[model samples]
Target: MPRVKAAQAGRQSSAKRHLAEQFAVGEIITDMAKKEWKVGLPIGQGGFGCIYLADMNSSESVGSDAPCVVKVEPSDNGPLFTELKFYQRAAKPEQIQKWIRTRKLKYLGVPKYWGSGLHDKNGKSYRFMIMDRFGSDLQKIYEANAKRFSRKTVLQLSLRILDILEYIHEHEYVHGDIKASNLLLNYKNPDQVYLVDYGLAYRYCPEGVHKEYKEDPKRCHDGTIEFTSIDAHNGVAPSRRGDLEILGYCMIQWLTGHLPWEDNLKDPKYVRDSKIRYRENIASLMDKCFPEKNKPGEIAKYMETVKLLDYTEKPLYENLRDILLQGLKAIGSKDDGKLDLSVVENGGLKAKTITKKRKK
Candidate 1:
């Protein structure tokens, strides 16, 4: 009996896991509002959750065509809890809609929050969130095209991302992790992109008050290594400037397919020092990232502007957009709402399987 109790204890302790348990297909779960959602096949997985295609309760089983997906994790997981709070506060469907109307935007890249609730299964509590399902991520397209995005694609993407950042920052949160993998294309419309995964989102500003910057050794280099902001490298809380700085790094990597400190990613100090040195010398950074004569001038301008931002100051979002818009202008194009994923080499076009056209 003693050995049996010890075995049960081992199983019980091991049950507390970082990953989520699977749900049966067609299982119905009710949200806080008492609305029911039917889970379909699993679509993806995060560090602490499982994402499954889902739909409102229907007598028929949920299908692949389900428009929404649910992310489920254990109730005790911190990342999902943080993400849930962000969505609850900043990403409501009506909130995004209102911003789009007020700003006269075709669309905003932030995903809409639908519903969420706690579920009990086999004596375990799980947290689940519902959201619109999206298609391929930019990282996949980036890798397939040899890690280089055309100037037109990069600028177009940057402009949309700027809009997203402005909205989230206005709502008092900063997305600490912004990378190609976190940018997803709309499931039905490749022309539209959405920013997903807010696990590292930080409320740098709360109730109209902004957080002050202070370096802590424990939080140093807190985000994706290659693109984390210099402030993050110093262990300060993520702020508006940090997000913009990260975006600047993203645009550089997107256009040139390489970052100056990418080779030394394992060494945090090397990465931090390189970023600090480059912030002081934008031209040198551009020179290193782009070829001597083929540099995108606007990218340099964008970096310089971001470099000037104070830790708690609100960003000149329109000015940043204008910078990227100028990039589009230099490329002999306009924001035509096309994500031409094709690669250009030596004055010739290499058609990619993925290109977006407006549904006329």
Candidate 2:
């Protein structure tokens, strides 16, 4: 069988899914709470929908400076319905802010849900949800920088993602898909990153009861081929460990520019076996990805930490953060919340000098 057979099987259904028609600029839409939002220009197209710049209804025009976005989809669509429920339950503005305050975190990476409602246009119904607007995505930045991020950048990004994962996992969901494309920069603040697109968000636990683990043949290979966890490859339900494992793969790719199995993505078995082999011997993975005497120790250490997690057991989130934190300190750097998207030799002197002003 040709490679991409597995990926093609998954995407073929997606390609057939309907795309949402665009809403007119300056059009007003209402939410369940009876509050109204005005739609600006469509920003981009996403699964079964269009993302448009938006704001609370006002006689004033919704300009480029709009602080929010509206995602509109056919009411019959599945992905948006799932994503909207995730937002309503886990991503409320007050919920995220309270967590940030209680946890003493500078910020959490989740995009807060403002409101959602059903709109009827020309007798056809559409589902629209409002959320914080974001700027550029990391995938474009990665490609622009020759497919690599500075080590400090990768570690810093993962630290925030860890915070996000902990919050979501605690709230009883697992983001099955975590990759650069899903990571977006805050529109007004480049330093802040947010995780978007909960279309694949899975609720592994419901009302404090964790779901039992099982592999379903019909669900095998159920995420982004390159970074999905082994559990996903086996058709097991996504869990906390699966999220962390996927993050581990993401960190490696962002830091080194490639995964060892990327070339054979068409062949799911080859990809799965390669990841299993690498997880067993991380040194081999470091050797293959780095190809130098100096390899990022924290990555291997992070992999080892994730290796010890049980399918349903809670992870030591702080311990995982410390692993990446040590990676920063080892390079004589600190988090400082700077994402430095530019290409720099792996955590070299150039990165240290670019640190945030010491006075702050």
Candidate 3:
């Protein structure tokens, strides 16, 4: 990186660490809620701050069993604001559930956005958002399944991603980050999987208005190195196709057990170049990894459809769904792409390490 960019990153890291270390367990804070929340143990950490499970008083209305995860960061920081805005548009339980049921799925793993506000106490200001606490991420699930997923599992997961992508895209945004870590299973429903951590989510269009793509040397390789889209490598804002591209890489990784770039995570050039190589000749790449099956061909077709999309174009969401669904049928999947954790090699359904709340 340039010295200036490196220095800027160093400063951001210091700021994040400084604010994160200041909080303690058992500290209580008032949300824009009827009940105050008592901070609990730190469960995880994100790019900007720490995540804690917070116990709420009886009056809290999240209506979930596990304590919600509260993300605490400095109010002045940019990531918290970016994430909050996305959640504000996304964290609706009723609408999301309706979307799931109308499409006729028993589960849709999505985080519920609770309340957020600036908390000023003891001479410090913190921005916090409370959301549904989730179990292990898909990365853990993938590793648990021996780092490989069955063809059935991969195709079912594709439907899940497509459902989610359509919803977010219809709302005019792209979840630029679509790696394993961001995919999570709900704390109360292991069968339900969610896509979390919208800190890198980019709103491609706002209020039905399209955003232009621009190049920036400083911003290339914007999202995760191993699975970012080619457009991201060009330093342009993420588009619908970019998200689908990232998801396509993820699909291949899950199905084939490994991506060529997995070992070269730190080297952006190697990772980006490898993905480009994969895109340029997906047929050859698929033939190498999945020589015996048409699943790889479906993936190639999926990428081909996505590559045809313009920066501001809406995807044929159902068309891509058909490609994956047919792959599921071809793979001898039971129940028309319905998820069954027991049959999956890994990737979160029926994960033993995960314990969710009792189903109501």
For 1-360, candidate 3 gives per-residue lDDT tens digits of 655533333333343346645657877778877557877777563223366777644454655544577877775645556557766676777976777778775355457777865677557787777777655567666777654766666766777776777677667556655666667665545566667666655555656665677644554454666655555656565556777777788887887777677787677677767877776777677778877744576677777777656545766667887876676677566463344443222233211110112213
Which portions of model 1 show Cα errors greater than 4 Å?
1-23, 45-49, 56-64, 215-217, 292-295, 308-314, 341-360
Per-residue lDDT over 164-283 for candidate 2, one digit per residue giving the tens place of the 0 to 100 score: 777777776666567566666655566767776676565556585766676445444435666556666665655667777788887887778766688776677887788878878875
Error (Å) of candidate 2 at residue 108 is 1.7
Better of 1 and 3 by lDDT: 1
Which 10-residue window of candidate 1 scores lowest in summed lDDT? 346-355
Clashing pairs in 1: none
TM-score of every model versus the real structure: 0.78, 0.79, 0.75
Q: What lDDT does candidate 3 reach at residue 342?
A: 37
**TM-score: which candidate is best?**
2
- lDDT rank, highest first? 1, 2, 3
Each model's total of backbone clashes: 0, 2, 1
For candidate 1, write residues 1-360 as lDDT tens digits: 355433333333334434456547887889998988888777663212357767845556755556787877765646666566766676666776887888886577776677888887658788888887754566667767656776777777877777777777777556655656666665555676777667656555658566577545565444566655665666665566777778878887778876668777778778777787887888677866677645567788887887766555767667887886776687687756687763321111111110012112
What TM-score does prediction 1 earn?
0.78
- Model 2 poorest ten-residue lDDT run: 347-356
